[PDB]
Amino acid sequence: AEINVEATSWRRVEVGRVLKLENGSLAAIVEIIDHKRVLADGPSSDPKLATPRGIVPLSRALLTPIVIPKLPRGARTGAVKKAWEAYGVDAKWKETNWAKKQLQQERRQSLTDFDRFKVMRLKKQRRFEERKALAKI
Amino acid sequence: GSLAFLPRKRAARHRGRVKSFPKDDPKKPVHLTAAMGYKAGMTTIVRDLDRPGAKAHKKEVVEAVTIIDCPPMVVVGLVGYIETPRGLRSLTTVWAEHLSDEVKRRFYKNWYKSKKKAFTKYAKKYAENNGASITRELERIKKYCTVVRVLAHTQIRKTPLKQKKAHLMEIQINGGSVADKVEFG
Amino acid sequence: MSSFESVVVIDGKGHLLGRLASIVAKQLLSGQKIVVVRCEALNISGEFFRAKLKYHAYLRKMTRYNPTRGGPFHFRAPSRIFYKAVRGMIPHKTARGAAALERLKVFEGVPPPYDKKKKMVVPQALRVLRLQPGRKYCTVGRLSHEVGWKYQDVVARLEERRKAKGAAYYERKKLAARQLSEAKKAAAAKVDPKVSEALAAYGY
Amino acid sequence: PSEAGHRLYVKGRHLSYQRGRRNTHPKTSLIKIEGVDDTAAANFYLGKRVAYVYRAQKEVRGTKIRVIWGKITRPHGNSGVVRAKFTHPLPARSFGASVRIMLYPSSI
RNA sequence: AACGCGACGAUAACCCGCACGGUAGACGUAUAAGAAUAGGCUCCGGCCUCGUAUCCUAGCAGGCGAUUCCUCCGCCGGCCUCGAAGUGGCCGUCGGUAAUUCGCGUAUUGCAAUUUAGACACGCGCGGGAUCAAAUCCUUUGCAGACGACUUAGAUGUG
RNA sequence: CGCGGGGUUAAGGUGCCGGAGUGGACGCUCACAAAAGGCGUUAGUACAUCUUAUGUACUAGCCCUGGGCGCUCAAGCGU
């Protein structure tokens, strides 16, 4: 009576699932409209992560592993903000690897030409300790 | 006349290409696939028939046969064939020492005007130790080819004919892995 | 994102025929050299038998074809089925059109120049990105094999050999991935950590 | 030794002239700048100098290199293609040939 | 396929004169798993929207001498490897070699007017004196022959 | 409707040939002729059972029968 099934465990869409829009802002689903549209809201204190309450097309969105546990359905902006601060969505999103890639990307894009000359010089110094280590092993 | 043979055209080659070989499987023993002979003549045979269902059982069929002379076949060369999306192709061919006289006059056209230096720097390559190339060439046959045909000729010097020019064809070795049929070759 | 390459090699597996042909023909006219490998692994949408009528329909509307250049010749290999697609998308009666086809170079399987090189993919012509999941599709290899292509088992066996060589390539790349990651961890203790934070504050 | 490049230009390709179905006007040319994909990126390259460099198989100044100079006038389409006007129109057989887009005049 | 192709055998030189140094488009023209997309990878810790990545990248178009480093690159040999339309690895010789820290010269090319720098085919291509190797022709032959056409055999020999 | 430079358009178009979107939203489809045959799919209407989800007939789509290349979560149709 042993069953070994290796299938794909996708992420549910549900009330409480927070999702990522393309502008870098998060929103918590509070009621599902159709198979293609849900209505969501992000009450984050961060100006970069805030999202107005409204319809989010799921094609434009991306499902994140974070989920609010017992978010009531159709909860108004105050009630989602209460669950937002209690569960700490912003802290969990910063730990999420998707945000580190975003923060790496933004810091890379803000590099000026003179700070680009550091990195060319600076990776060269780091690379030199890499090669005597690589030649050792 | 049959449409499968018309339009009628002369054979562009006197010997005639075999055009088809039996299919090869490794499980059989190593053996060759063809030989050349010389049409000497034809005679009469009486035979004790033992064919079931035949009213001529245990009786004397009179039949006509042909006598095809077959001189011992001197083996001179080996060829290996590699498989390509544009069909089969020659990857390489290899020969031996001491190539006999009548096989060069096939390689030539005017024996008497020309002088005898066919296969000279090839035999010099065999004697002056480029053996790594023959080690390269024989192993190249082992590793890559999938069809190996041997190169051998008949000898006029044994058979009663007024010619002296030899006759070359390629004869396959089937029945084995690619490793076995080259060491035999 | 609109980068100019010397030659770009397109893997043909899982790519739709005419969408790959339309993208390739625009790059050839723009001045890009194209090499297509695995033309036997291309895909044509719809069931196999729908591909059979349009093969029979093309031979219908042409009285007295040339046996060597056209007619059923074009369907007798997968490489030249694709070449027939790109040629109808390019002004072949102009010298600009002839020049664009000389930039193209199509193959069945992966020849030895191009198995050591990098094979890219075209997202806008991928079958699994453009076709609905329930829709049925055919392979151009089995289209040409049922027309008269003779080397389907040939290109198969050379490809299963190429996988075996590729298996040894990863096993060498595995060991390089161990040593590179180990050397990164090993030299990080003596990496002068005034400068390690400098790279982290710059994105590297 | 440096072992570095010396390129100070963006690479481009001469696509075609300004044309309809069948009426081509040679006095304006179409350039695909490498890296530009929207009309927004094309707005950076407007009024930048553009050179077409080729070889002629005769030395007139000790060199077989000849240059035709021009400028990027306006964006074209939605895909970042730009319109270029040169002192003389580009040949015709340069359709799909390299074009050097300089970074001057600069407003950065 | 006489206007497709592969392998192999045998294969043209010195002297004198004299004319010039292409390519539908190099400028870092760097990057090899396979396979699936109702899954997959792995260092077995974990990881995958994102190639928005990785390598390389400073100096007279990149000098000289140091301090200083045994890192990187290149050429020849050896050992192996690569054949679907052939190539890379390792070792050794030699040459160069900002990971770090300096002292020397660049100008008046006078505020832009070509950044005259790669790869391949042979250096482009020619006229008179100068040498092998074959074939065509010749004689002959008959398994071939309407005529052409085809095939033997002629130079030392089982002629 | 004179000869030129620049800008904007109409009718038509923006997958390639071909300048311009493999653009965005929502559905449907896999190729003569009649109240015609569909145990193909979707959309709507009218009747009947039910702790005492269904099953019968229609209406509307649109399909099976009655320029090249190529396309099918379209490069087809409607807005």
- DSSP string of B41-72, one letter each residue: EEEEEEEE---TT-TTTTSEEEEEEEEEE-PP
**Cα first-last separation, chain B:** 43
Q: Phi and psi for C54 in degrees, rounded to 5?
A: -75, -20
Q: How many CB atoms lie within 10 A of CB B120?
A: 10
| Cα A35 to Cα A57: distance, rounded to the nearest angstrom | 10
- With contacts defined as CB-CB under 8 Å, which chain C residues touch A121? none
CA D93-D95-D100 angle, 5° bins:
110
Query: Is any atom of strand F within 7 angstroms of residue C24's beta carbon?
Result: no
Tokens 């970074």: give the residue: D103
Cα atoms in the Cβ-side hemisphere of radius 13 Å centred on B144 = 18
Tokens 């697609």: give the residue: C85
Q: Which residues contact B104 (CB under 8 A, 6 or more apart)?
A: B116, B118, B119
Q: Say which amino acid occupies B67.
A: I
Cβ B158 vs Cβ B20: under 8 Å = no
Query: What is residue C16's DSSP assignment?
Result: B
Cβ C49 vs Cβ C55: under 8 Å = no
Query: What is residue A59's DSSP assignment?
Result: G
Pair type for strands D98-101 and D10-19: antiparallel
**CA dihedral (D75, D76, D80, D82) positive or negative:** negative
Which residues of chain C between 62 and 121 are close to nucleic strand E, CB under 7 A? Answer: 68, 95-96, 99, 102-103, 107-113, 115-119
Closest Cα to residue A25, out of A10, A43, A39, A37? A43
| Cα A64 to Cα A14: distance, rounded to the nearest angstrom | 12
Q: Which residues contact A18 (CB under 8 A, 6 or more apart)?
A: A26, A27, A28, A29, A42, A64, A66, A67, A68, A89, A93
Protein residue nearest nucleotide E156, by CA to C1': B112
Reply yes or no: is the peptide bond before residue B85 cis, omega within 30 of 0. Answer: no
Q: Which residues contact B25 (CB under 8 A, 6 or more apart)?
A: B174, B175
Query: Is any atom of strand E within 7 angstroms of residue D15's beta carbon?
Result: no
| Cα C83 to Cα B137: distance, rounded to the nearest angstrom | 38
CA A117-A119-A122 angle, 5° bins:
110
Q: Which ranges in chain D belong to alpha helices (H)?
A: 39-42
Burial of C174 (0-12, 13-18, 19+ CB in 10 A): exposed
Q: Does the distance separating the beta carbons of C108 and B84 come in below 8 Å?
A: no
Helix, coil or strand: residue C80: helix
Helices A113-136 and C193-200 sit at what angle, rounded to 10 degrees? Answer: 130
Helix, coil or strand: residue D90: coil
Chain E bases having any atom below 7 Å from a protein CB: 1, 5-11, 21-40, 42-43, 47-59, 61-63, 70-72, 82-86, 96-97, 99-100, 113-116, 133-137, 141, 143, 150-156, 158
Q: Which residues contact C171 (CB under 8 A, 6 or more apart)?
A: none
- Measured CA to CA in angstroms, residue C32 lies from B161, C4, C25, D32 at distances of 67, 8, 9, 12
**Cα first-last separation, chain A:** 48
| Cα B164 to Cα B154: distance, rounded to the nearest angstrom | 11
The pair of three-digit structure tokens given for residue C101, joined into one six-digit string: 């086809």
| Cα D19 to Cα A134: distance, rounded to the nearest angstrom | 58
Query: Is any atom of strand E within 7 angstroms of residue A101's beta carbon?
Result: yes
Closest Cα to residue A38, out of A71, A7, A87? A71
**Which residues 21-60 of C have a C-beta within 8 angstroms of D?**
29-31
Cβ A59 vs Cβ A43: under 8 Å = no
Evaluate whether chains B and D are touching (3 or more beta carbon pairs less than 8 Å apart): no
The pair of three-digit structure tokens given for residue A37, joined into one six-digit string: 């549209």
Query: Is any atom of strand F within 7 angstroms of residue C122's beta carbon?
Result: no
